[PDB]
Design a protein around this ligand. Structure first.
Ligand SMILES: O=c1cc(-c2ccc3c(c2)OCO3)oc2ccccc12
Ligand SMILES: [Zn+2]
Lengths: 47, 161
């Protein structure tokens, strides 16, 4: 695993082309995330 | 030390997690190649993940970050999709869940769009799809995502395609 840019705790990938896309984020320490909910699902075939 | 607690579909907590899952689906530029073709999900179950030690590990680090960023952890709830979700809920996130060839370098990646995390449930690029049918767009096989509490702190802003 790499390090965050010096002076930062994470990276934010801000989409600047696909108008519909929301952000993606990267952390570089396992301890900066807690897996709160486990969601079980199926994707649905569109009509 | 992990226990899973099932939420009732009648619980408001179930309901607000379901809504965050359903409402953040979008179309993807790969036309559904990695993740499949869908506009919504059938939610089968939502479980709360409880582990004292992983929680205290998280809150200890969160305080550190907070104290380095004008008392602001900058905490979000974000989706994570992975073939390793069972290791993650039992032992926590670590470098073995890093995306070594990710566009922002080798760390652990999270998404605001549930449909984005959905693309990694069977691996990078969706791998070879579901174990049973080898179908990245399987409508039968049960999938699993995590909805996670993530401390961002001072976040480096990278504009990108
Ligand atoms: O949920 C995600 C999981 C992953 C992910 C990446 C590499 C992996 C992984 C998950 O498990 C196997 O190696 O990538 C993302 C990238 C952007 C937004 C969300 C994700
Ligand atoms: Zn399948």
């Amino acid at each position: 695993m790499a390090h965050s840019p010096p002076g930062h705790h994470s990276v934010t990938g801000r989409p600047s082309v696909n108008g519909l896309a929301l952000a993606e984020y990267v952390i570089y320490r396992g301890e900066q995330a807690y897996p709160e909910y486990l969601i079980t699902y199926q994707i649905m075939r569109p009509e | 030390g992990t226990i899973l607690i099932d939420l009732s579909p009648d619980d408001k907590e179930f309901q607000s997690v379901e809504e965050e899952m359903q409402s953040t689906v979008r179309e993807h530029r790969d036309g559904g190649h990695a993740g499949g073709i869908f506009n919504r999900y059938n939610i089968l179950k939502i479980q709360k993940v409880c582990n004292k030690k992983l929680w205290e590990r998280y809150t200890h680090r969160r305080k550190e970050v907070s104290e380095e960023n004008h008392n602001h952890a900058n905490e979000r709830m974000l989706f994570h999709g992975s073939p390793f979700v069972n290791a993650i809920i039992h032992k926590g996130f670590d470098e073995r869940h890093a995306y070594i060839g990710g566009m922002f370098g080798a760390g652990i990646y999270f998404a605001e769009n549930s449909s984005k995390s959905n693309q990694y449930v069977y691996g990078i690029g969706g791998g070879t799809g579901c174990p049973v049918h080898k179908d990245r767009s399987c409508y039968i096989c049960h999938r699993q995502l995590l909805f996670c509490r993530v401390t961002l702190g001072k976040s480096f802003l990278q504009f990108s395609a």
